[PDB]
């Protein structure tokens, strides 16, 4: 099965990439027990620039064509206890994102689920929470609420909701 991201404008096929990582914000407050909720970063370019893993291309939510890790996915933060600090997630095995030009970009659902399972186990480890929930962006300007990216000097805005809508136990 295939996960899709609608995009405006329509990304050309040569704008296909490998997702090599991503950045997220942890919802704060006393947790509803015993769950931690994670969304694509509520921050901005500053957060992304400090991650040190973004690479050449300028993107939000997902890192494109960036660096990878050795054997396992590694999450990193300036301070995991601080909900105002974003969590930088570096994949070890990249996930292809095929753009078609029809208007949407696609990724393997099995491969992303396999990826999300690994991220969840690392987060579950760092925070100790039994369950991990990925949810869409809390809000923000168009460039951040969506997975947005610069290819060939053109800005593309892709709805990443199908990427971030699962619960892990």
């Amino acid at each position, epitope marked *: 099965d295939t996960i899709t991201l609608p995009c405006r404008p329509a990304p050309p096929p040569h704008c296909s990439s490998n997702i090599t990582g991503l950045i997220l*914000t*942890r*919802d*704060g*407050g*006393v*947790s*509803n027990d015993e769950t931690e*909720i994670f969304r694509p*970063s*509520g*921050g*901005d370019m500053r957060d992304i620039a400090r991650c040190q893993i973004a690479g050449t291309v300028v993107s939000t939510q997902l890192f494109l064509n960036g660096s990878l890790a050795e054997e396992e996915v590694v999450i990193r933060s300036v*301070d995991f*206890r*601080d*909900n*105002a600090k974003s969590i930088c997630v570096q994949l070890a095995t990249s996930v292809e994102i095929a753009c078609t030009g029809a208007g949407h970009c696609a990724i393997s659902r099995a491969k992303w689920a396999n990826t999300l399972k690994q991220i969840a186990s690392k987060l579950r480890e760092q925070f100790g929470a039994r369950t991990i929930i990925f949810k869409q*962006s*809390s*809000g*923000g*300007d168009p*460039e*951040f*609420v969506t997975h947005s990216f610069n290819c060939g000097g053109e800005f593309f805005y892709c709805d990443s909701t199908q990427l971030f809508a699962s619960t892990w136990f």
Partner: antibody
Amino acid sequence: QVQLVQSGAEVKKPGASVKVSCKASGYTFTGYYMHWVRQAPGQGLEWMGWINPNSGGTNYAQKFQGRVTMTRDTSISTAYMELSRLRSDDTAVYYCARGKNSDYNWDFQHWGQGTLVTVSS
Amino acid sequence: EIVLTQSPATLSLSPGERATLSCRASQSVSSYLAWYQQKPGQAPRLLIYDASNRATGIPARFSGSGSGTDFTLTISSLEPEDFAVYYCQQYEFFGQGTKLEIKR
């Protein structure tokens, strides 16, 4: 010369919604996150959420997800906090607040005068 | 949740004595804490940040220190303006408060 000025007290029936504004001045608005913190009468301080004024990105406390919406208008240096579906235990003084520093930004050096919001019937 | 337990609930002292408030954090993050002072009908005011640094316009009688899980706010020679409620903060969590009144 940092000043935070909030809108006036309001009286609201249950089920209704309230929007509280916060005009910021004396610093570069986009440089700091704006927080909202409420205080019920006779009780302590409870954090509601922050808004990144540069991106409009937000982080709300889990107990407020689905009912709170924070936005800002950088054009006029004003942040907004909207609380919908009001109930009686939402009666509180609501404060906008800003960290003293930008790194660890949770030491609230600056506060508005606070907006009293009474939920009715 | 980071649970912060302040001590004591009420502190009864006289103008000139040494006040000592404490705050225990249910973790180990020991370099970040804030202390506020609050008076009736007024916004809270920052007194101490980073466990031990004075905020804006804060006289030298106020100080703070951090013993790992434990943190303390110290008020040498209490003035009558110093009598109020005091909350401690770490990230988005606050303490339940300690009230400091005149002992009579």
